[PDB]
Design brief:
Chain B: It is found in: Nucleus; Cytoplasm. The structure is a homodimer. By secondary structure, chain A is mostly helical. Chain A has helices spanning 2-19, 24-32, 45-54, 59-83, 93-112, 132-136, 147-158, 163-174, 185-206, 213-241, 249-255, and strands at residues 40-42, 116-117, 120-123, 128-131. Chain A is built from 11 helices and 4 strands. Chain A starts with a helix and ends with a helix. The complex binds the ligand CC/C=C\C/C=C\C/C=C\C/C=C\C/C=C\CC#CC(=O)CCCC(=O)O (3 copies).
């Protein structure tokens, strides 16, 4: 029944609004220019030093440390959203942990696209905007932590998904029965099946002119997994080069693999 | 009129049956008898065996924590079936769930308790009151005030039809801190209260002032919750898992 799929799409959207304070709709209105919501822009070291006045160690390290703290808050938001996905909490506790461990970063890069356009990224709940050029201009190896995220984002954003869409897509990501170390693959796959059915109808209803959008979205999961693995490789470099740099426990446990 | 009140009661009963896998009726049958006996946990070896069938004290309290999170999702779903709830301001919904869940967890837990112990694992097991109370401090004191609450609550002899409305009344509390629009909430709760009153008059004609007696139990519930939070602050003085439970 179509109607049970619609109801589940509605529930997931509602949870998504409750779990994530900065939605794509809000991010786009800020980026577009929809007076009231105008961000301060950080394109250089002086603008960055100014940003601390009107927005909420070393500069490159201060920035990277900021991202990692933000990434932790995002993991908490994603974690709260996951608990809302029907069946998730009823799964074996080790599998819940495993789904989260492999899922959360893919979800982070998916939603981070919402806060990006080709020249920059929203920061600090959208009060600030840090330019893409400025992030590139960071001393090695920090120069190119964000670049693969921009490249993914520009392309992902051409799909034109809205938040209702994304709510379902991120649920589909989390409930992937091919995560390494899963004890009970079957219960997970049965939930994903249902979520995939919900996503399929949603995209057909919400984007009736956009052909094979469902398949086009699913193929993007290939791009997400690539971004994760490259980011891990970059993180291994940093720890060795910046022996004075402190990585957040949560994030360390996630990356253990 | 009275028929809108019956419509609402029935709507809530049907949703409560859909949302909660283990009903009071089903739990009473298993506690009195009616088919496999639940596996009983009365001792340490019993527990050890129970895990295979289906610090000990820490592992038991973590288990109640995991179940509590399951119950939050069941309660959340049920709340969405209450007429008016989804039309409320989003922040207010989250606020009503945030403060309402604990009161409901303990209300429904009474359903699974008698004076001698509590059903666990969806009624596949029975953990004895004595075994819970034997647990080293401060764990031994955690379940006991719930049992005390439950013996008195259960004396009202509510069924699932009654409880379904009562639960909704608890969710639509206008006095939760942080609420943005208290009006439509109180307005829904007034209507839920009307349904609860007529439900109790029809379902229990002989039980005088059962409605008032039930509302007085809200004092007992909030005290339990406040007392739980207190013991939880004490427990904090002793990774991805931490996050899930929060
Ligand atoms: C004042 C703003 C606070 C923190 C962000 C500041 C600069 C970061 C610049 C761009 C990033 C945009 C938003 C922040 C959130 C995620 C971006 C990141 C990403 C990753 O590279 C993951 C980093 C987590 C880690 O440190 O491992
Ligand atoms: C102060 C931290 C600096 C920058 C980001 C601050 C807030 C991000 C804005 C809103 C967050 C709330 C809900 C939206 C959820 C996900 C979209 C996102 C995001 C990010 O902020 C990027 C984090 C991604 C990463 O760490 O890679
Ligand atoms: C070990 C995780 C708990 C349960 C397994 C999942 C579903 C079985 C359904 C109910 C079992 C309930 C509790 C078993 C664990 C600890 C006992 C404690 C307490 C409670 O029994 C749960 C109270 C929540 C509620 O039913 O409202």
């Amino acid at each position: 029944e179509s109607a049970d799929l619609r109801a589940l799409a509605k529930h997931l959207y509602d949870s998504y609004i409750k779990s994530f304070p900065l939605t794509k709709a809000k991010a786009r209105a800020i980026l577009t220019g929809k007076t009231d919501k105008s961000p301060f822009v950080i394109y250089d070291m002086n603008s960055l030093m100014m940003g601390e006045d009107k927005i909420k160690k070393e500069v490159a390290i201060r920035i990277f440390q900021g991202c990692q703290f933000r990434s932790v808050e995002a993991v908490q938001e994603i974690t709260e959203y996951a608990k809302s996905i029907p069946g998730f909490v009823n799964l074996d506790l080790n599998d819940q942990v495993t789904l989260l461990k492999y899922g959360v970063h893919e979800i982070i890069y998916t939603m981070l696209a919402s806060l990006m356009n080709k020249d920059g990224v929203l920061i600090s709940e959208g009060q600030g905007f840090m330019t893409r050029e400025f992030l590139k201009s960071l001393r090695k190896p920090f120069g190119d932590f964000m670049e693969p995220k921009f490249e993914f984002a520009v392309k992902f954003n051409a799909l034109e998904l809205d938040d209702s869409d994304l709510a379902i897509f991120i649920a589909v990501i989390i409930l992937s029965g091919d995560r390494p170390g899963l004890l009970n693959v079957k219960p997970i796959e049965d939930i994903q099946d249902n979520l995939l059915q919900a996503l399929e109808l949603q995209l057909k209803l919400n984007h009736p002119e956009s052909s094979q959008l469902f398949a086009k979205l699913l193929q993007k999961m290939t791009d997400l997994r690539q971004i994760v693995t490259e980011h891990v490789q970059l993180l291994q470099v940093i720890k060795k080069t910046e022996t004075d740099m402190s990585l957040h426990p949560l994030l360390q446990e996630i990356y253990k693999d």
